[PDB]
Design an enzyme around this catalytic site. Structure first.
Site, short mmCIF file in Angstrom:
data_model
loop_
_atom_site.label_atom_id
_atom_site.label_comp_id
_atom_site.label_asym_id
_atom_site.label_seq_id
_atom_site.Cartn_x
_atom_site.Cartn_y
_atom_site.Cartn_z
N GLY A 10 -4.96 -4.68 -11.16
CA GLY A 10 -5.29 -4.66 -12.57
C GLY A 10 -4.09 -4.65 -13.50
N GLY A 17 11.75 -12.31 -13.98
CA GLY A 17 12.44 -11.05 -13.76
C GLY A 17 13.92 -11.27 -13.52
N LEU A 18 14.70 -10.20 -13.51
CA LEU A 18 16.14 -10.31 -13.27
C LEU A 18 16.45 -9.83 -11.85
CD1 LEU A 18 19.12 -10.67 -14.36
CD2 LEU A 18 19.03 -8.19 -14.83
N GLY A 19 17.11 -10.66 -11.04
CA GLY A 19 17.46 -10.26 -9.69
C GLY A 19 18.74 -9.44 -9.69
N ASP A 44 14.16 -6.76 -10.40
CA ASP A 44 13.95 -6.70 -8.96
C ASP A 44 15.12 -5.96 -8.31
OD1 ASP A 44 12.40 -7.73 -6.50
OD2 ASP A 44 14.47 -8.37 -6.09
N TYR A 49 20.64 -3.12 -1.59
CA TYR A 49 21.58 -3.80 -2.49
C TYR A 49 22.71 -2.85 -2.90
CZ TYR A 49 17.80 -7.28 -2.96
OH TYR A 49 16.80 -8.19 -2.70
N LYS A 78 12.28 -2.23 -2.81
CA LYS A 78 11.81 -2.56 -1.48
C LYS A 78 12.24 -1.57 -0.41
CE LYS A 78 12.91 -7.27 -3.08
NZ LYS A 78 14.17 -6.93 -3.81
N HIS A 111 10.44 -4.73 2.60
CA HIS A 111 11.48 -5.76 2.45
C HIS A 111 11.42 -6.90 3.45
CE1 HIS A 111 15.67 -6.16 0.42
NE2 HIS A 111 15.16 -7.35 0.68
N1 LIG Z 1 13.08 -10.14 -0.71
C1 LIG Z 1 14.18 -10.67 -0.18
O1 LIG Z 1 14.36 -10.78 1.03
C2 LIG Z 1 15.21 -11.27 -1.15
C3 LIG Z 1 16.16 -12.18 -0.64
C4 LIG Z 1 17.09 -12.91 -1.39
C5 LIG Z 1 17.02 -12.73 -2.77
N2 LIG Z 1 16.11 -11.77 -3.37
C6 LIG Z 1 16.05 -11.43 -4.84
O2 LIG Z 1 16.06 -12.60 -5.67
C7 LIG Z 1 17.11 -12.51 -6.67
C8 LIG Z 1 17.67 -13.92 -6.86
O3 LIG Z 1 18.10 -14.60 -5.66
P1 LIG Z 1 19.67 -14.72 -5.24
O4 LIG Z 1 20.49 -13.61 -5.79
O5 LIG Z 1 19.69 -14.97 -3.78
O6 LIG Z 1 20.17 -16.06 -5.99
P2 LIG Z 1 19.87 -17.03 -7.24
O7 LIG Z 1 19.26 -16.30 -8.36
O8 LIG Z 1 19.19 -18.23 -6.69
O9 LIG Z 1 21.38 -17.47 -7.62
C9 LIG Z 1 22.31 -16.51 -8.13
C10 LIG Z 1 23.57 -17.27 -8.46
O10 LIG Z 1 23.32 -18.23 -9.51
C11 LIG Z 1 24.23 -18.02 -10.61
N3 LIG Z 1 23.58 -18.34 -11.91
C12 LIG Z 1 22.62 -17.65 -12.56
N4 LIG Z 1 22.22 -18.28 -13.67
C13 LIG Z 1 22.97 -19.36 -13.69
C14 LIG Z 1 22.95 -20.34 -14.68
N5 LIG Z 1 22.12 -20.27 -15.72
N6 LIG Z 1 23.83 -21.38 -14.51
C15 LIG Z 1 24.68 -21.48 -13.46
N7 LIG Z 1 24.68 -20.51 -12.52
C16 LIG Z 1 23.84 -19.44 -12.61
C17 LIG Z 1 24.73 -16.59 -10.46
O11 LIG Z 1 26.02 -16.41 -11.05
P3 LIG Z 1 26.47 -15.10 -11.87
O12 LIG Z 1 25.70 -13.96 -11.32
O13 LIG Z 1 27.92 -15.03 -11.57
O14 LIG Z 1 26.14 -15.42 -13.28
C18 LIG Z 1 24.72 -16.41 -8.95
O15 LIG Z 1 25.93 -16.83 -8.30
C19 LIG Z 1 18.08 -11.50 -6.07
O16 LIG Z 1 19.23 -11.08 -6.79
C20 LIG Z 1 17.14 -10.49 -5.43
O17 LIG Z 1 16.70 -9.61 -6.49
C21 LIG Z 1 15.21 -11.05 -2.55
O1 LIG Z 2 17.39 -9.19 2.21
C1 LIG Z 2 17.80 -9.53 1.10
O2 LIG Z 2 17.13 -9.09 0.01
C2 LIG Z 2 18.99 -10.38 0.69
O3 LIG Z 2 19.90 -10.46 1.79
C3 LIG Z 2 20.69 -9.34 2.12
C4 LIG Z 2 20.96 -8.27 1.22
C5 LIG Z 2 21.76 -7.19 1.64
F1 LIG Z 2 22.00 -6.19 0.76
C6 LIG Z 2 22.31 -7.15 2.97
C7 LIG Z 2 22.03 -8.23 3.86
C8 LIG Z 2 21.22 -9.34 3.46
C9 LIG Z 2 20.98 -10.42 4.47
O4 LIG Z 2 21.74 -10.58 5.45
N1 LIG Z 2 19.88 -11.26 4.27
C10 LIG Z 2 19.39 -12.15 5.30
C11 LIG Z 2 18.38 -11.53 6.22
N2 LIG Z 2 17.64 -12.23 7.08
C12 LIG Z 2 16.80 -11.37 7.79
C13 LIG Z 2 15.86 -11.77 8.80
F2 LIG Z 2 15.73 -13.06 9.13
C14 LIG Z 2 15.07 -10.77 9.44
F3 LIG Z 2 14.18 -11.13 10.39
C15 LIG Z 2 15.21 -9.38 9.09
C16 LIG Z 2 16.13 -8.98 8.09
F4 LIG Z 2 16.25 -7.67 7.77
C17 LIG Z 2 16.94 -9.97 7.43
S1 LIG Z 2 18.11 -9.82 6.22
#
Ligand SMILES: NC(=O)c1ccc[n+]([C@@H]2O[C@H](COP(=O)([O-])OP(=O)(O)OC[C@H]3O[C@@H](n4cnc5c(N)ncnc54)[C@H](OP(=O)(O)O)[C@@H]3O)[C@@H](O)[C@H]2O)c1
Ligand SMILES: O=C(O)COc1cc(F)ccc1C(=O)NCc1nc2c(F)c(F)cc(F)c2s1
EC number: 1.1.1.21
Length: 316
Positions: A10, A17-19, A44, A49, A78, A111
């Site tokens: 709900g 959002g901001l990563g 996020d 992290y 997460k 996560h």
């Molecule tokens: N659940 C999971 O397993 C998981 C995994 C990966 C990611 N995430 C989340 O998703 C968020 C985003 O993904 P990500 O950090 O992997 O990468 P992303 O947002 O795809 O890319 C980040 C990069 O893009 C740059 N950037 C941002 N805006 C830009 C723009 N307008 N023009 C040119 N470059 C730009 C940043 O530079 P600057 O920062 O230097 O500006 C940084 O180097 C994370 O930070 C995290 O919260 C979650």
């Molecule tokens: O995780 C993030 O948010 C962003 O990434 C990361 C963020 C951190 F702060 C530290 C490591 C990673 C990383 O190495 N990422 C890649 C993964 N791949 C796997 C994978 F395939 C698994 F099956 C299990 C697992 F746990 C991971 S973590």
């Protein structure tokens, strides 16, 4: 288009959002303060992290300054893999609430589906580089997460990096009390995820797209890996709309009814990334962008491929 999406609990989740992954502790506080000033209401985070305390400082300062009220913010964190054990889930959540300086989380996600051996090490490895798994199963961990909702620590619970069979496992859990509200997965033009997204949306699960820009700053990024930001084809589409390629890449998932969380610690980019509600990609643009898929996944780890719950061996 609507700035927020309805969750099955709900509540409304801001679609933008901001990563914060990779945002340095000494820069993330300013990044979040500027983001809130510019309009972001969704942040996020994750304990892994290692910057949640600093993110919390920014949130508290803006709450204190009265730039926003708590109910207007949507904070997401997460549960890391080393806390999948039933008795460690609550403590892990409490640590994050303490660092963020909040009494509740809007959304808390598992996560990764893989549970690791408990300890101080985020990635416990054995003598051969293989991650050491814990004998916990996703269902028991889900039960522990549901308890956080009943105790008031979090408003909604979800999953991240779960393939369709793992999502199905939870949906078919005996005694299921709360369905996952969100599945946060990697998604961009080189990894479109059509099948998994259709599956999740059909089950009423909101999908959040992470690494929308290809995560160019990922630590394992190698000198000549694909670059979405510099793809000439995407640059042409951006040019046609008088927007940057980043704005096109952020608008893309939004029109597929997904939540998107681009990361940036740069004030100008943080502001540029939010100016994506004033234009629209055509159906033709969308289908063209989708045609660029190459099943190129940037977020995976070889050391986890032997884990029984590794999510990427399945097609989706
Ligand atoms: N659940 C999971 O397993 C998981 C995994 C990966 C990611 N995430 C989340 O998703 C968020 C985003 O993904 P990500 O950090 O992997 O990468 P992303 O947002 O795809 O890319 C980040 C990069 O893009 C740059 N950037 C941002 N805006 C830009 C723009 N307008 N023009 C040119 N470059 C730009 C940043 O530079 P600057 O920062 O230097 O500006 C940084 O180097 C994370 O930070 C995290 O919260 C979650
Ligand atoms: O995780 C993030 O948010 C962003 O990434 C990361 C963020 C951190 F702060 C530290 C490591 C990673 C990383 O190495 N990422 C890649 C993964 N791949 C796997 C994978 F395939 C698994 F099956 C299990 C697992 F746990 C991971 S973590």
């Amino acid at each position: 288009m609507a700035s927020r999406l309805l969750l099955n609990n709900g509540a409304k989740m801001p679609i933008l959002g901001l990563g914060t992954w990779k945002s340095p502790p000494g820069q993330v506080t300013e990044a979040v303060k500027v983001a809130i000033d510019v309009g972001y209401r969704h942040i996020d985070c994750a304990h892994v992290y290692q910057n949640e305390n600093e993110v919390g400082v920014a949130i508290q300062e803006k709450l204190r300054e009265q730039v926003v009220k708590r109910e207007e913010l949507f904070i997401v964190s997460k549960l890391w893999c080393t806390y999948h054990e039933k008795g460690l889930v609550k403590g892990a959540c409490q640590k994050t609430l303490s660092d963020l300086k909040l009494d509740y989380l809007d959304l808390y996600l598992i996560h990764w589906p893989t549970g690791f051996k408990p300890g101080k090490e985020f990635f416990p490895l054995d003598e051969s580089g293989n991650v050491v798994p814990s004998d916990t199963n996703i269902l028991d961990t889900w039960a522990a997460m549901e308890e956080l909702v009943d105790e008031g620590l979090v408003k909604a619970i979800g999953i991240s990096n779960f393939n369709h069979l793992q999502v199905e496992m939870i949906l078919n859990k005996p005694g299921l009390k709360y369905k996952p509200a969100v599945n946060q997965i990697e998604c961009h033009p080189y990894l479109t995820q059509e099948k998994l997204i259709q599956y999740c949306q059909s089950k009423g699960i909101v999908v959040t797209a992470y690494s929308p820009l290809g995560s160019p700053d990922r630590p394992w990024a190698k000198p000549e890996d694909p670059s979405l930001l510099e793809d000439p084809r995407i640059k042409a589409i951006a040019a046609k709309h008088n927007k940057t390629t980043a704005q096109v890449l952020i608008r893309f998932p939004m029109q597929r009814n997904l939540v998107v969380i681009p990361k940036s610690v740069t004030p100008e980019r943080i502001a540029e990334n939010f100016k994506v509600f004033d234009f629209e990609l055509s159906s033709q643009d969308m289908t063209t962008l989708l045609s660029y898929n190459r099943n190129w996944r940037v977020c995976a780890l070889l050391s986890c491929t032997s884990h029984k719950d590794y999510p990427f061996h399945e097609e989706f």
